[PDB]
Amino acid sequence: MRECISIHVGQAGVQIGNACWELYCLEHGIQPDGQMPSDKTIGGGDDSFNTFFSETGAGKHVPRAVFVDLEPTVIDEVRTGTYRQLFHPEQLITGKEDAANNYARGHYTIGKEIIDLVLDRIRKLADQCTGLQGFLVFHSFGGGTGSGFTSLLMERLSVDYGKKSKLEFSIYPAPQVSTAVVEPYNSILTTHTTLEHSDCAFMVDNEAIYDICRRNLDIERPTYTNLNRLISQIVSSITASLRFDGALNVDLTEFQTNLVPYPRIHFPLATYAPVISAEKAYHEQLSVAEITNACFEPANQMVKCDPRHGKYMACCLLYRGDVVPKDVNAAIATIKTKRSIQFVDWCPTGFKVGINYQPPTVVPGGDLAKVQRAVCMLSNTTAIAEAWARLDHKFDLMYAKRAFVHWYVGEGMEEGEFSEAREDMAALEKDYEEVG
Amino acid sequence: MREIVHIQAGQCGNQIGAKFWEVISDEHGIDPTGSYHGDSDLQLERINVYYNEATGNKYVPRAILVDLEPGTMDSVRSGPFGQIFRPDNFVFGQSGAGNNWAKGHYTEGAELVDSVLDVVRKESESCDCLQGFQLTHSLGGGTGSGMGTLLISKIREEYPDRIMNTFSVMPSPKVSDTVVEPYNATLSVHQLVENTDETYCIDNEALYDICFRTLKLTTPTYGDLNHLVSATMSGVTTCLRFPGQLNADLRKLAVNMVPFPRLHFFMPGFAPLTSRGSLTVPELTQQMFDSKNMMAACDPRHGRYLTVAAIFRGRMSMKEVDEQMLNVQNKNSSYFVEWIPNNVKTAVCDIPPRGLKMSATFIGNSTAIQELFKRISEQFTAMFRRKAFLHWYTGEGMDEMEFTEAESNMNDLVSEYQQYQDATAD
Amino acid sequence: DLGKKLLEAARAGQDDEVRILMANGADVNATDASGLTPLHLAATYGHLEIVEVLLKHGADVNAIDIMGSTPLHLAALIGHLEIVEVLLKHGADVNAVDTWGDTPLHLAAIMGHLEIVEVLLKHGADVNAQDKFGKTAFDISIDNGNEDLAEILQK
Ligand SMILES: Nc1nc2c(ncn2[C@@H]2O[C@H](COP(=O)(O)OP(=O)(O)OP(=O)(O)O)[C@@H](O)[C@H]2O)c(=O)[nH]1
Ligand SMILES: Nc1nc2c(ncn2[C@@H]2O[C@H](COP(=O)(O)OP(=O)(O)OP(=O)(O)O)[C@@H](O)[C@H]2O)c(=O)[nH]1
Ligand SMILES: COc1ccc(/N=N/c2cc(OC)c(OC)c(OC)c2)cc1O
Ligand SMILES: [Ca+2]
Ligand SMILES: [Mg+2]
Ligand SMILES: [Mg+2]
Q: Location of the Glycyl lysine isopeptide (Lys-Gly) (interchain with G-Cter in ubiquitin) covalent cross-link (chain B)?
């Protein structure tokens, strides 16, 4: 058992963190007050769920999590929500004034006034670990805090915890549910600064989650609550191997081993199936082959791109529920006979399989129906370079006119950092092109 | 990012500023005494942005009333909400400025500026997290224009990290045919480009043309004009006074509306245009981008929108608003710059203004605003070429070079709007 | 020198001081450093009575300063309708041109003195007169979007 600490930065990271930990409790049988009746050992243990939860003397199971935001409105909802008694009060850290959608405010000016308090609270949770393996960082790209402060936090974490792994869950901006015009700026600035301090980053495209809600869940105008419930279902499927017994991706190191062949190209694509509306409660159950075929359809991906336009460097299939392993073999053998699946010359053209035999949990109030079997595919493909291309184009349109740059320079940031960040993105695109 | 310190200077600033408090207090449920009479919790949730809470559940506007003319103070107290203002915040001089920008900025108003700053500090230090300052004034007079810009400069020195927002009323011969108003306006614009983060351009030329030609008011009065102002000031501050889906503040507005520091003069619009006494979503979206609904006498179809923020108020489908707003950006795609993606932001608020069920307030950063500054610059130049009444200003300490610099900076501002109106993405 | 005193009395609006100075031989057509006469200053500052008394004592109604401004130019610019009509009744050149190419119609249109615009048109103002930039009075109305002014020029 090796402990993992989750860090939730900004509004997106906090609200998505709230839905994830709610789902974690239902999967592990933890009540909103922290009580876990099926926990035989009271006051501690070495079980798989202890990687994410610590235990008090009174049998209370506390998430190994820190919530940080530069303004308190969002985090205050956690202090008065359903799971208010679940988190330590000292884990929930708020400022008074946010970054105003400005990377420089979150990183240079406003972020510096609370950075040291966040690390001291993180160190308090780290000292309670017998074998800390790394951190999970939740944040948006477009927010000033989610981008500026996150970059500042990841820098300090590389210094204080050099050997520890750092995994990201990042929210890729979408025009449908955006907040700021300068979100392409903040997205490029935090990607360049965090690139060397992050070992693996799972991008969540808000446009992809938005369309899945409209098309699969029949939700006319999705809100953050609809998107975050779906996102947490995917985040749970990615971290289930850390919280349960398993044979695939049992620790944060194996994530990089299985998904990251080279450091700079550490942006796996996630695909989840099936996504069925709760109104179709009596839906027919899909087979292993059916949900496996759905993982290669662009309409089920967490980032909008066409994997048929790119080559695969890794592919992991994580199943949950009534899944007979020999049915996966036959289902994979059918996929291997498809021109849409092309691996690079240097990678062993194989699929890694991990099966958790417990069906997925649905949150009461959610838009998802119960299913007997589901699958999450984590793959590293060069087709995700299209997502960086769309982001770089929006950056180039505004930066060529130097629009909004004065807001960043006015917060203690040299203008050359825009070009340095942009050139790094141009290099990242070439890294994908040189692979495939 | 919570409390805003409101200031109003001169006859116009106090007149339109008084109507502003009468409108938002009615929307929040505050009576002339200062008690909450509302029926919804959404009225007190962000009430601290503009009001100070006193003992007895009594809300007092965080407003500072300034004028060199003592007569304006009495007209404010005789108003419906004249008693709700803190009497310590009335800072009124002895002699007026006589429509002389040099008096308000260098002599008369310079003597009274320190008395105003003392009241500002007392209100600012009583704030949990000061968001910024909000000033209402005219540019054609002497007090609101000359001393108003002086107040902005001093406040900017003591609070350099706070947002400075103005509601500036542009002069027009159709309303006040005083020939020195182009002088006072140009000198103020020179100050507004440097010292304010965002300015709402309220044009008396536009207000008159709306009353005369659209509302068919044969002889419009200031109350007819101020009715359009208060409706606009209510709309533009909706996301500051009510929760909504966005934690909007004065800095997030400036960051997302002002792509270049000098181009921070906004063109506000309102729909529907009504008069005192007297609507589908596609009608609101269409009528909002109409030149007859703009509070600045400029045709937006003669320029390009850099950024646009639209506020809808009332019961309506936020999906229909998303569909209708996405429609306008396609028919009028040539009126939006293509090198600022997703430059139109829409907010929907449930609480509509008084006497209206559906409302649409428009805040545009458009290059067509140069038509407003070209008009003032031409009148200024016509007067300045003949050196008419220049001794009224130079006789108060003003150097003649200050007029040339204001005119130069005025023309530079126009060139910058034209520069980005013609720029393409390629 | 009574010419300098008459210039100040014309600007200040001292009617009695104007009559005393003229009765003692003051130069009615005296000029200041820029070429302004008492009639220029009286028409600029809206002293209708001083305008009339000067015109009854040999004041040149069409005198120009260094910039080529006539009294009608300044009266149309500042917006003194009564003075404009008095000057026109005493032979002021309605189409006089200054160093900037401006006629009194140009200045009255730029400043929005619509009633003065109508009077100048009624006395033969040239709507086709251009300034040094080719702008006519109608061009100014179209450029600044003054619909009220554009109607008057098409009567
Ligand atoms: N999926 C999802 N996205 C969100 C959520 N909240 C905000 N976002 C996205 O995050 C981006 C804006 O960043 P925020 O996280 O809201 O800003 P912040 O991190 O609090 O930083 P500030 O600028 O200081 O407010 C926008 O693109 C939003 O679409 C959420 O709850 N769920
Ligand atoms: N829309 C509107 N404009 C006004 C109002 N009051 C004055 N103005 C305009 O303001 C300009 C003159 O400025 P004022 O505010 O009246 O004068 P001041 O700022 O107090 O300075 P002083 O002239 O020295 O007294 C004129 O162009 C008026 O048209 C008003 O109530 N509503
Ligand atoms: C042009 O794009 C943007 C502009 C401002 C942004 N947020 N700031 C505010 C938003 C407002 O209405 C949407 C608003 O009401 C008018 C407001 O009042 C203070 C602030 C976000 C944007 O993406
Ligand atoms: Ca245990
Ligand atoms: Mg935030
Ligand atoms: Mg006054």
A: 58, 319
| Upstream peptide bond of A274 is cis (omega within 30 degrees of 0) | yes
Same domain, B279 and B219: no
**Which technique was the structure solved with, according to the deposited record?**
X-ray
The distance of Cα B49 from the centroid of its chain, to the nearest Å, equals: 17
Contact C9, C21 (CB under 8 A): yes
Cβ contact, residue pair B388, C73, below 8 Å = no
CA distance C104 to C77: 7
Number of domains in chain B: 2
Alpha-carbon radius of gyration of chain B: 21
End-to-end CA distance of chain A: 38
Classify burial at A317, counting beta carbons within 10 Å of its beta carbon; exposed 0-12, middle 13-18, buried 19 or more.
Answer: buried
Nearest to C18 by CA among C44, C60, C47: C47
Q: Which ligand places an atom closest to the C-alpha of A15?
A: 1
- Alpha-carbon distance of A164 to A157, in angstroms, equals 9
Q: How do the domains of chain A map onto residue ranges?
A: 3-269, 270-387
Burial of A281 per CB tally in 10 Å (0-12, 13-18, 19+): exposed
Sign of the CA dihedral running B208, B212, B216, B220: positive
Distance CA B417, CA B93 (A): 39
Instruction: Name the CATH topology of A3-269.
Output: Rossmann fold (3.40.50)
CA of A60 to the centre of ligand 4 (A): 10
Rounded to 10 degrees, the C-alpha dihedral B230/B231/B232/B236 comes to 100
- The set of residues, in sequence order, having a beta carbon less than 8 Å from that of C107 and lying 6+ positions away, is B382, C73, C76, C77
| B295/B207 Cα distance (integer angstroms) | 6
Pocket-forming residues, ligand 2, beta carbon under 6 Å:
B 10-12, 15-16, 67, 69, 96-99, 138, 140-145, 169, 171, 175-176, 181, 204, 207, 222, 225-226, 229
Alpha-carbon B309 to chain mean position: 15
Q: Which helix (H) or strand (E) holds C20?
A: helix C15-23
Task: Compute the distance between CA of residue B220 and CA of residue B7 in angstroms, rounded to an integer.
Answer: 27
Q: Same domain for B251 and B275?
A: no
Task: Provide DSSP, B103-145.
Answer: HHHHSHHHHHHHHHHHHHHHHHTT-SSEEEEEEEEESSSSIII
Structural domain for B189, as ranges: 3-268
Does residue B251 have its Cβ closer than 6 Å to ligand 3? Answer: no
Catalytic pick from A27, A155, A254, A386?
Answer: A254
Residue A122 is classified by DSSP as H
Amino acid at A419: S
**Nearest by Cα to B331 from B367, B299, B289:** B289
Q: Phi, psi at residue B342, to the nearest 5°?
A: 55, 50
Strands (E), B240-329: 265-271, 305-313
Q: Closest Cα to residue B261, out of A418, A409, A394, A102?
A: A409
Verify whether the Cβ–Cβ distance C78 to B388 is below 8 Å: yes
Domain A270-387 homologous superfamily, CATH: Tubulin/FtsZ, C-terminal domain (3.30.1330.20)
Distance B165 CA to ligand 2 centre (A): 19
Task: Determine the Cα angle at B383 with ends B381 and B389, to 5°.
Answer: 140
The tokens describing A357, both together, are: 């035999």
**Residue A316, by phi and psi: left (phi above 0), alpha (psi -120 to 50) or beta?**
beta
Q: Which residue has the tokens 């995700």?
A: A384
- Cis amide leading into B282 (omega within 30): no
The DSSP line for A177-197 is T---TTHHHHHHHHHHHHGGG
Cα–Cα distances in Å, from B403 out to A171, B146, C66? Answer: 52, 14, 21
Compute the distance between CA of residue C25 and CA of residue C42 in angstroms, rounded to an integer.
19
